[PDB]
Amino acid sequence: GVNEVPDYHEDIHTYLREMEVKCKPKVGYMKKQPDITNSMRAILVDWLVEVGEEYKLQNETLHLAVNYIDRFLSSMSVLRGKLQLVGTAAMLLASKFEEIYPPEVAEFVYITDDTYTKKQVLRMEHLVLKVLAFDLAAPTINQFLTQYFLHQQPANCKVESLAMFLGELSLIDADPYLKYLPSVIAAAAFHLALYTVTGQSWPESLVQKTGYTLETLKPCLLDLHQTYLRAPQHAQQSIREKYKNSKYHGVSLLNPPETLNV
Amino acid sequence: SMENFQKVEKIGEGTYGVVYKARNKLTGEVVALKKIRLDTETEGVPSTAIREISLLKELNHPNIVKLLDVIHTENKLYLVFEFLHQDLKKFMDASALTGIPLPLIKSYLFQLLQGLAFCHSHRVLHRDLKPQNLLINTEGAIKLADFGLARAFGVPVRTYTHEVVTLWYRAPEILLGCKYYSTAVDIWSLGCIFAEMVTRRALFPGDSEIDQLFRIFRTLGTPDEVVWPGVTSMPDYKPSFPKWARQDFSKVVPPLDEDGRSLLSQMLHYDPNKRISAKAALAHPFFQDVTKPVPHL
């Protein structure tokens, strides 16, 4: 019923797609950053996952924060010593945007081990706000997933949890996932996840919704499978640790498929 | 920064400090300035403003107040808004004795629904629709304003902040303390506002939540599973609620025609799922003849 906003689902989808284009980071930003690297970024996002888990924040908050970080680094040269300052400030902004009960600024200062002063966090907040020109309402992988999980006639906790997980793994790795739009990554996560559990594919209903076939979703699905396969060996583990818990039904502990079929 | 704005008068005071009417010295544009003090050593930019600014940035429609600029300093944020003559509440009270022409009521409700249809078609809930937050000009327009309690939602919706609408305009789903709420709550509020434009008194002026609840039942009939499935397994529902009957909208809103009464009931339906959508309501027979009259000021 009204919680799936039937009279509006279409219009919202159209709009989110149009918006995920404008809020897209620069694909090749990491090359034009002299002093920071995909590796350092990986550490940062992994740290936000922890922070998200420690403060029991929403997954959506985490996604937004990463969106804020990539777009800032798409405009602003940052030194390595201040990369965390940007991330703390972004998480702060996303919390304020998205959470009912955001952590107080003091707790965002606590998690940086007093690397930074409160004044620095608060000043970086304003600067982030100016650099994004307050365009904070970014469509996320989750905003697409939640809608895709709807066309999933057989509602599967395991499938829903698993897609979230693949979803989050993509946050960590600027290469390759900066070159895919959220809507795409959500589908690839959603396809990959359904198959692994039920045995099924991207449904036609979602083909008609998105205009996305498995042909057009293959490049991404390839990188994702790879990411899933290498997952236990990735230098960044917070997400796997996260999705062991009962809450997410231990989907991380599940063994990925070995072939996809195309 | 603000050197080109000349303050005229104070025009309001809400979430963030005071709102002032001001005049662009160079262009002659009249504006409303909202001054938001930034907690530079404590909490920073308030979540309210992050939400209002970001959401109003996206929302560009003739029936949503235009945010024209945001002027930053180290220590303050000024939001530059278009100036509109006054809010519906002030217009209502000014019209307490003369009444509001039916054609203007219809025009106003039509525009309100157009504005609101836009907000919902853009993953945004207003959640503070009340006459004081709706602005009119002199040429016959009305606009949604004050988007501070607004929230960009996902699909499906999740649990959002429970302390949302002003009591009088609060939907039963929020009162009863349901886990999920959606676009229907904003329709409920407009429905309250339709009634109020017609009678110039608030429809459900409750002193408390329990009183608000009783006020609605008495008018629309204590709901049951046949009208509102799940109403009895709602968190704050009580089997004990007296069973009042629905009052004829011919005594509720005597001045309202057969089409009006129909659309109202639809807007005030108990069940959120069966409650009309802003989009639906835009098609309703009531608006078939809608014009754009000017208000007497």
Ligand SMILES: O=C1CC(I)=CC=N1
């Ligand atoms: O305190 C910290 C910061 C970061 I970035 C990663 C891990 N611990």
Ligand SMILES: O=C1CC(I)=CC=N1
């Ligand atoms: O500095 C200011 C503040 C205001 I309110 C209006 C004009 N100039």
Ligand SMILES: O=C1CC(I)=CC=N1
């Ligand atoms: O300078 C501005 C104006 C506006 I409208 C939004 C954000 N920044």
Ligand SMILES: O=C1CC(I)=CC=N1
């Ligand atoms: O934009 C606005 C705000 C206010 I308070 C009054 C009139 N116009």
